[PDB]
Design a protein around this nucleic acid. Sequence first.
DNA 1: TAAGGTAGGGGAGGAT
DNA 2: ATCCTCCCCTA
Length: 986
Amino acid sequence: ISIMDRSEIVARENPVITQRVTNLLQTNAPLLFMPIDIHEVRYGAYTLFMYGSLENGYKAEVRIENIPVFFDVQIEFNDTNQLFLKSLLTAENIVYERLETLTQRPVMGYREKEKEFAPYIRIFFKSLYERRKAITYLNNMGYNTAADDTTCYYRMVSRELKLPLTSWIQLQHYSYEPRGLVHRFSVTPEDLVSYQNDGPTDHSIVMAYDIETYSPVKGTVPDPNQANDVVFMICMRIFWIHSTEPLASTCITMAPCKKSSEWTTILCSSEKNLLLSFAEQFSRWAPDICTGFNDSRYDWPFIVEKSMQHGILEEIFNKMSLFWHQKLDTILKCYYVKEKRVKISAEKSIISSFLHTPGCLPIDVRNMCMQLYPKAEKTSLKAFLENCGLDSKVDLPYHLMWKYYETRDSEKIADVAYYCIIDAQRCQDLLVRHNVIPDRREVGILSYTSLYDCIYYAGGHKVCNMLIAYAIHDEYGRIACSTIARGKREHGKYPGAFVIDPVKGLEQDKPTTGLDFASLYPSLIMAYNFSPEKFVASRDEANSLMAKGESLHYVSFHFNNRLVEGWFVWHNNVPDKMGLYPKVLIDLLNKRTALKQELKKLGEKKECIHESHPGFKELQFRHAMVDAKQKALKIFMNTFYGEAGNNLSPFFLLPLAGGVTSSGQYNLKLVYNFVINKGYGIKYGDTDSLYITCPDSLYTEVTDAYLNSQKTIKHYEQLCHEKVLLSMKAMSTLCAEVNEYLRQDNGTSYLRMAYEEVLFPVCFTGKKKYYGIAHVNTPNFNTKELFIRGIDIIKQGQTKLTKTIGTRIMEESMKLRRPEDHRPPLIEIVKTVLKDAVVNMKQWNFEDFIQTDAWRPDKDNKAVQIFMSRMHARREQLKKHGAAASQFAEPEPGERFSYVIVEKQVQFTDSSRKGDKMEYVSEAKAKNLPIDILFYINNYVLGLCARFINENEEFQPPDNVSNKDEYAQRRAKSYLQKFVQSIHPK
DNA sequence: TAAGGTAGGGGAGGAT
DNA sequence: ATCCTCCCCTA
Ligand SMILES: Nc1ccn([C@H]2C[C@H](O)[C@@H](COP(=O)(O)OP(=O)(O)OP(=O)(O)O)O2)c(=O)n1
Ligand SMILES: [Mg+2]
Ligand SMILES: [Mg+2]
């Protein structure tokens, strides 16, 4: 049996480049290296430990020594300042290396052309702990501190040395030592160069592993805390960082397993032996990344707890950590990351617990997939595989494989091992198909962060790191930035974007085109030079700047019932005067513009090929991928705006965020006024998008054609066709004119309007609630899909009943109808559909009523809290009875669960609370609990339909009512309710 | 220990 | 029944 470790595997797979790499090693020649995992020694002399793959694929550890550990604080230039700081630090028993003095540009507040530079002193340390304690003491005492990354220092090293931690790096004049399977390199920052050009094929190793565990009690998830519960199988596979074919495969199991040519089978007699074999195989492979699906919630905690039970955590960790010898208490304290919070989206966070062995980066494929699909209803492996078009995994059922382990059948154990290997292969397929690792590497290169940051952290700190990286470069004059928020913070919301009260109702005659600002907030930042180093706060300083001829953008808004005013120095289209925020946003916008033009060409090449072509599907997928990429960039740039409005951010500037919002409102209103003055009608507005209709005169002559024909259905379809064409061309001309007007107004070309589609039949039901038929290049009314924004059918956790009713409403409203023919209003269509739904009740089955809700214990969502309080009481009652209550078990905090509303019999007590009516789908199907359909109707679809019908005059309030929309919505709700009781036989 | 922003619709439950 | 707060999710 040839148990090939990393070295022989690399030599076999890539022999020529392996020989070249070996020759370079003997000749001590510079060589390329891809880092993945970053580790730091915070105590004692600071050393940066990178782990990764050489050019051929050899595992390599790079130890960067003599890195300057430092942080700077701004104080006046005088010789006694150094001695005073010496005394201050020595009084706090803080050991430091040396003192330096320099000049840097503060990031906050505009300064004159000869006063950008302010004095700074740089404090050096041998250890990260001393630097951390000194930063804390100095900031508590009150000095302004910059370059003070405290939570971690590798980000500061990466941004300071211009050295991305996720890109190829060239090693020069290194100190080489081969030990075991690890080629250790001792280098210095001066001897270690970034390799940015034409990066070769990456040869990092990613192993996907899955575990199968056993519990004697049936129907329960095996608890690692339970002694009798055992992990009995581990299947693992190594792949290239870019390829889905397995370099090698290994299965470790309890029961005997028949030999399979697809993987190496390792047999163990005890759980301690199985864990030891897992550690041994991990050490022999020495992967650059260790990944699994839901491993940060199930696999890693199970393995760690079992190893603690067997008392072998120190041994297996030391074996997995290359040569990093750490004691058990240190392993539990630091390396076993427990209950780490990972932000998936807004108000959405998940838990992750894993053993971060040095030399390997842990990846949870579920975390990455949820980050890519933050609005995914189902977060299972099968759902994620289906979403991206990957092949369906042959599911291993529950009782089958627990029975198979019980029977000690060799071939059944082999089949379970095959399915576990398939699970690992699906993990790698998800990693590669979405290009997760290269995308995270690109993000790390852009933001000068490690891959670990790109995996387990959100983008706000990435925005801060990218800003500081762009700030510390001499071309910009060495802007000095802090990384931790300072100053008193307020609770509230500054004024945001402006939403135009929509002209509610269906439009079937005047085509409506959405014109959107391209990167509205970033474009405003570029145009008005919104940047903290270009910000003036005091009115007298602004007046003095006017006296010197400088153009300032003045903004004012009401925050916390007080007036916040500010002035921003305009760049005058001069690259020298361009701000830091505008510069970073120019770079990001150039990147996104390249991505957008590539996406546009790929969309125009995909539109000319019919979908049945074999090469279309994946190509279509590629299109989405590109879209996702630019979407990410968009979000990233928007984060900059948000990072100026977050009071917890180091770059927090309430005047800047308020100014961005006020400038967006002003520009939207300016374009609104200009478009209205040019005779075009406007239906709706949202932040930056304006929905504009051509004047009827522009459609006169073509209408005359339809007026001069016999007016068949195809005649009106054609008439709509050239109406949409005329729309497109008229909006193109109007967009050019509006862009020229904006250029004349603000003096820059950053603020540009853009046409994206035409919604000729379009219904606006309320603020952020509209839909229509989208025409991008040519009219196509035969598209079943509809451009939808804000309608309840797309809401997360919505019933299939609500989605079906809303889809019926919108598809009936979007139907093309000649003006001579009958044109039913939304009232009649909605009433007809609702009457069909209520009267023909049999059309709704059980699957149409499942809702989905997220269990957040810290959130007092009263309905679900009561529902699961009842479930906890029922579980207590069943355990008292001695029966199993796993079917009623509490879902783990954070995940979403499915439930239905049932008819709770009236026992004239029985509150009509939704909390007492929620039930899990499992027992509702099991016990055939009736579904309270009328509850569903009156509480979800009735309110949905009220939004559609709220535009009628009868529901309109008298002019004295301030909130016309809410009053109309409530009146429509009441009217539709009364209609329901009138039509429903009770 | 990390975690961009505000505007807004609408369900659930309780005060009242 | 009105109104209010909390919550979820979307814009
Ligand atoms: N997650 C988001 C999404 C949007 N916006 C704000 C910023 C945008 O500038 C403004 C405009 O909405 P868009 O969705 O159109 O975003 P952009 O205009 O910036 O880019 P693009 O026009 O390419 O969509 O909405 C935001 O702050 N945060
Ligand atoms: Mg499995
Ligand atoms: Mg826009």
